[PDB]
C-alpha cells in the first residue's frame, strides 16, 4: 500500500468494480456487501463479504470509501433489492477527501445504477445497517440542493 497522493484527476476500476457490485447483486454470491476504496487515484473493490459487521469494521476516521450494501425491500409485490452506495467518509480526514470523494461518486455510479441512492455516512453510529434499513424503507425525498456560486 502507502500509495497516495493529491490530484485532480481520478479513475475507477469499472472490470474489478462492476464484478464487486455484482457479487452483492446477484441472487447469492456469498456476499451482501462490498466497499470500494482507492488505490491511487483510482477507485478499486476495497474490502467484501456477506457479514456486515466486517465492513463497519474497515470504515473508519482514518479511512474513506463507498460500501455497496444490498437490502431486502421487496415484500408488497416482487422480491427484488434497492440497495445502497453508503458513501463512508472519515470524520478526522482532511476536509478535502470529504469535498472529493463525493464528487468521486460519479464514478462509482457509473456501475451502481440499479441500487437505490448512495447513502453519505460520516459517523459509525449511522453505517448500523438497521438505520440505513429505515432509510430504504421509504425511499423518499431528495437533496437537490445546490448553489453555481
Given at each position: 500500500?502507502?500509495?497516495?497522493?493529491?490530484?485532480?484527476?481520478?479513475?475507477?476500476?469499472?472490470?474489478?468494480?462492476?464484478?464487486?457490485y455484482?457479487l452483492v447483486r446477484?441472487?447469492?454470491?456469498?456476499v451482501i456487501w462490498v466497499?470500494?476504496?482507492?488505490?491511487?487515484?483510482?477507485?478499486?473493490?476495497?474490502?467484501?463479504?456477506?457479514?456486515?459487521?466486517?465492513?463497519?469494521?474497515?470504515?473508519?476516521?482514518?479511512?474513506?470509501?463507498?460500501?455497496f450494501?444490498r437490502?431486502?425491500?421487496?415484500?408488497?409485490?416482487?422480491?427484488?433489492?434497492?440497495?445502497?452506495?453508503?458513501?463512508?467518509?472519515?470524520?478526522?480526514?482532511?476536509?478535502?477527501?470529504?469535498?472529493?470523494?463525493?464528487?468521486?461518486?460519479?464514478?462509482?455510479?457509473?456501475?451502481?445504477?440499479?441500487?437505490?441512492?448512495?447513502?453519505?455516512?460520516?459517523?459509525?453510529?449511522?453505517?448500523?445497517?438497521?438505520?440505513?434499513?429505515?432509510?430504504?424503507?421509504?425511499?423518499?425525498?431528495?437533496?437537490?440542493?445546490?448553489?453555481?456560486?
Amino acid at each position: 500500500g502507502s500509495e497516495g497522493a493529491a490530484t485532480m484527476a481520478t479513475k475507477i476500476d469499472k472490470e474489478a468494480c462492476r464484478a464487486a457490485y455484482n457479487l452483492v447483486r446477484d441472487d447469492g454470491s456469498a456476499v451482501i456487501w462490498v466497499t470500494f476504496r482507492y488505490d491511487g487515484a483510482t477507485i478499486v473493490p476495497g474490502d467484501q463479504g456477506a457479514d456486515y459487521q466486517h465492513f463497519i469494521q474497515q470504515c473508519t476516521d482514518d479511512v474513506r470509501l463507498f460500501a455497496f450494501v444490498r437490502f431486502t425491500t421487496g415484500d408488497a409485490m416482487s422480491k427484488r433489492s434497492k440497495f445502497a452506495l453508503i458513501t463512508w467518509i472519515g470524520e478526522d480526514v482532511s476536509g478535502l477527501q470529504r469535498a472529493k470523494t463525493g464528487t468521486d461518486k460519479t464514478l462509482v455510479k457509473e456501475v451502481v445504477q440499479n441500487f437505490a441512492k448512495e447513502f453519505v455516512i460520516s459517523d459509525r453510529k449511522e453505517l448500523e445497517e438497521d438505520f440505513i434499513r429505515s432509510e430504504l424503507k421509504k425511499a423518499g425525498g431528495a437533496n437537490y440542493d445546490a448553489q453555481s456560486e
